[PDB]
């Protein structure tokens, strides 16, 4: 979530993703902790015994066969953490994740209910206003004239500067707003 | 592989600003600036029962007796069960009992 995906997944990343998914489905089958630990050590032994492959064409073939085996032997209802997608509590508080710009449309009475918070909000707004021009200049400088471009973003590289496009990251709503 | 120095420094600065923003999300102790108990049985249930129950019961009973019973077929009830040996209040007659019950095995 906090990192952007690359153009393609390398072979090592595909193998590690398969290993983690296989362990999760193995725990979904095993339920009990001791049984899960036994069969997870067996799965780790399988991955270790196929680890040192040098041809890499046979390694891709083994990865394909292992993926076929996983799709044949996966749990129909694997365990999902509640906050994870497909879980029971996933996107539950999106109805409460109100974006911060409605305080701009708040009435002066409602602002008068919270004086100090709105003063600090104005300070954040002024900081954003200066940093926007600074970071637009930085992003224009940092952009390659031609070639390969990814979704990664530069940090602040000088004193008294903020990272570009920091507003929607820093001022995002909390995961438990209430 | 791990973080690049680029992404690591960006995440560190973004997280520090996130700490500052969440710290500023706190409330001052004056926030927000807003412009006969007895016991539960003797008082708390008493006024609720006399307000939300008794007065609506008065209004409902008034409507039932003086606006629904005054209409012909509004409140229609089935006939009561009349068993042998009973005495009718309205008529005054006692219906005869049943027969001699020849079976007395159980």
């Amino acid at each position: 979530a906090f990192c952007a995906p690359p153009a393609y997944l390398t072979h090592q990343q595909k193998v590690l993703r398969l290993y983690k998914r296989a362990l999760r489905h193995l725990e979904s089958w095993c339920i009990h902790r001791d049984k899960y630990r036994y069969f997870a050590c067996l799965m780790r032994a399988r991955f270790e015994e196929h680890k040192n492959e040098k041809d890499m064409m046979r390694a891709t073939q083994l990865l394909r066969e292992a993926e076929e085996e996983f799709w044949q032997n996966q749990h129909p209802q694997p365990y999902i953490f509640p906050d994870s997608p497909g879980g029971t509590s996933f996107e539950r508080y999106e109805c409460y994740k109100v974006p911060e710009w409605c305080l701009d449309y708040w009435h002066p009475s409602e602002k008068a209910m919270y004086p100090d918070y709105f003063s600090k909000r104005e300070q954040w707004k002024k900081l954003r206003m200066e940093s926007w021009d600074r970071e637009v200049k930085q992003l224009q400088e940092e952009t390659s004239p031609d070639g390969i471009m990814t979704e990664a973003l530069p940090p602040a590289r000088r004193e008294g500067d903020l990272p570009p496009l920091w507003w929607h990251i820093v001022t995002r709503p909390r995961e438990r707003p209430t | 592989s791990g973080y690049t120095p680029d992404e690591k420094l960006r995440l560190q600065q973004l997280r520090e600003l996130r700490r500052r923003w969440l710290k500023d999300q706190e409330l001052s102790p004056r926030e927000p600036v807003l412009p006969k108990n007895m016991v539960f049985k003797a008082y708390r249930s008493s006024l609720f029962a006399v307000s939300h129950v008794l007065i609506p019961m008065w209004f409902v009973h008034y409507y039932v007796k003086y606006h629904m019973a005054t209409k012909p077929y509004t409140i229609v009830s089935s006939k009561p069960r009349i068993f042998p040996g009973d005495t009718i209040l309205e008529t005054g007659e006692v219906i005869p009992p049943m027969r001699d019950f020849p079976d007395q095995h159980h």
């Binding site: 911060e100 009435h107 909390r174 | 706190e26």
Partner: peptide
């Protein structure tokens, strides 16, 4: 305590 501000829309109108 440690109470936090809750972002809400303009319910005033």
């Amino acid at each position: 305590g440690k109470r936090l501000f809750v972002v809400k829309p303009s319910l005033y109108y």
